[PDB]
Symmetry: C3
């Protein structure tokens, strides 16, 4: 239609997934542009095309990969979205919410998210990591919040509070692992601005974001964070900085997706190892 991300429809998708894999996952992962290699290293993995799963959103107009992958990483049972849904593609609120709510029904209690983002804070360099500690949701302020529509009461409340959407203990664990491996000099914390996209933030938008307290800006993540928070899934979200948009504005330097993907390639293996250790270590609560 697209179908509504309701209890019945999410249950039908979860039923199918449980029949095709015997994996009851505890952790969900959604990976940023060029940051998906960990999904290829899931052990005893089961690849389920979105197109095979009842009620999953149609992704053939955008094309490219679209699989749910289940298996084990670091002794833990996980489910990954291989082929992230971005709202700049035109996916509706219901299409974004359904896969996360299916994760919830499958057993997911922690969602780990990566993205590629532009740096606003002057401290940030290309290749740095930012642990996201809060956000500025321009679509949400502007009546395009991912939860606009009827509330699905079986998943969560009509009015979620987002002040604890980014779990503090998970940020602390991520930082501890970076310190153990001596890459903590790459790791910052910051506020993520959600630019709906798909045009990169303009130079004057970047300057505005700096004035408003934003540390990084990107086109993803906040919708999934909100759906997860609504249904009680804890979240860790990490941005990989492709560029510093404030410096680029001052120096008339352009940004493009090829530059973004080159930064992703430069940090992909380190991010994979970091997230593998996070998965192995995160409290089995």
């Amino acid at each position: 239609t697209p179908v509504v991300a309701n209890y019945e429809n999410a249950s039908m998708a979860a039923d199918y997934i449980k029949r095709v894999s015997n994996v009851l996952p505890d952790i969900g992962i959604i990976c940023g542009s060029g940051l998906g290699k960990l999904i290829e290293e899931i052990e005893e993995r089961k690849v389920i095309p979105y197109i095979n799963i009842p009620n999953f959103p149609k992704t053939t107009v955008a094309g490219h990969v679209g699989n749910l992958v289940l298996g084990s990483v670091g002794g833990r049972k996980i489910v990954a979205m291989q082929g992230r849904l971005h709202m700049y593609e035109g996916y509706s609120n219901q299409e974004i919410a359904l896969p996360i709510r299916v994760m919830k029904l499958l057993g997911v209690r922690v969602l780990l998210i990566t993205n590629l983002a532009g740096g606003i804070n002057r401290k940030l360099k290309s290749g740095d990591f930012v642990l996201i500690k809060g956000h500025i949701n321009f679509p949400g302020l502007g009546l395009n919040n991912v939860l606009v529509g009827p509330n699905q009461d079986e998943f969560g409340p009509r009015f979620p509070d987002l002040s604890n959407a980014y779990d503090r203990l998970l940020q602390q664990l991520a930082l501890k692992i970076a310190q153990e491996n001596d890459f903590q000099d790459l790791v910052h914390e910051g506020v993520y601005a959600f630019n709906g996209g798909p045009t990169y933030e303009s130079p004057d938008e970047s300057n505005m974001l700096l004035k408003l307290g934003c540390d990084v800006v990107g086109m993803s993540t906040v919708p999934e964070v909100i759906i997860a928070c609504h249904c009680g899934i804890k979240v860790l979200a990490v941005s990989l900085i492709a560029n510093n948009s404030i410096l680029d504005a001052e120096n008339d330097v352009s940004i493009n997706h090829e530059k973004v993907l080159a930064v992703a390639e430069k940090r992909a293996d380190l991010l994979q190892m970091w997230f593998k250790e996070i998965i192995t270590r995160l409290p089995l609560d």
Copy 2:
């Protein structure tokens, strides 16, 4: 469809209402969360379910009460919306506009509005009242203004000016009545930020709103104000402060709808008496 909030469709609804009640109302009221008790005290009242009124928006997906109530308060003929339409539910621009335009055709020249809101200004405490003197309409800046769509010329102009949307004399009368009853220490004036919702403003969004000159933030009111202003209805809008979001961000205190409704209960009777006196006193122009 939903139907268009045009002259013909609004007239058909008004025709029905005039046949079911002999009340020609001069004043409209729309009440905030937990602030609806005055509607139950309308004298010689006629309760008309929205579902009975031709062209009124369907509200059964959200459920809960949805009635138009007509009768007398303080010697004046009034019409109330019992069960407010909020845009975070997914109601379209046409669905929001039609009931206000029906009010206009029925004779309404003044619309009184209450809401529950978060405090941004550091002066504001839970339980305070804010007379709204202007707004920052994030949905409107972002192409979700309630007037996006064809203009309905019979109601108003293509490009309304909102600099006089909140009538100054009505604010002055509201304040005078608070002074007469010695609760003026609870009363402030301020700029209302419209957060489309339904998630509460995040801590970092609250900090941004402070920087931008916002005094309070909420998820309602601005759409109705704009439809009223477009068709020449004067507006008084009063926010009841549920919490101070800036202090809550500094102290890691959460907000939820149960806390909101508890503040509503604490001030409901005083707000009812205040608005009853406003209705009784507001100039019969």
Copy 3:
């Protein structure tokens, strides 16, 4: 449907236009409110109603003029939109994009745009011109960017960079011509804030825009700029200042479309002469 602004649909419209006119235009023009007289002075002109062109957006609900006009100005072949499409009317992303993509297929490599706007910068007076050097796209930040939807790869990339959307050489040429004619005292440069509309920026929104680095605010232009930039068309965009919204807020002065059109009439002939000279002079690259 509206139809998708894809390669096939834009080609069908271009085919029709090429059959009805033998004009292969190099320059496109889109003119602001009351600023369309140059279109009436196109030489050897061919007027093609939008309603006659396959796949052009339906504009009969809004009504008013809607023609594509082709011919010669200053020795150059041009195509003009007579009757601009504004997103506050409810036109979709596909409806806005199709005419610009048709321009691209017809041969357009430079798009000249005028608009009427409110002044935010304190230096700006009614009747001044602002060469637009960048923008703040509130709809784009808020998930209403004109490119939301599937990417049309034949026209441009999924993620455009807008740092060079407003050609610097074209701004320099426009300014040089103003200096040659001794009206450079009217000409400024500035950042344009896109208010989706159709309500004028409220006084408190104007104050916010000043804090955020905006020089002017209006309800058009940015969507066309983005579609042009996406498909490699260079842009010059010039705002005519109808009023200073910051001064109006301080002095409680209203704005309305009649005042806007009166400023347009006061500068229409000078703007026509300026743009005619720009067309004549702009580099035949």
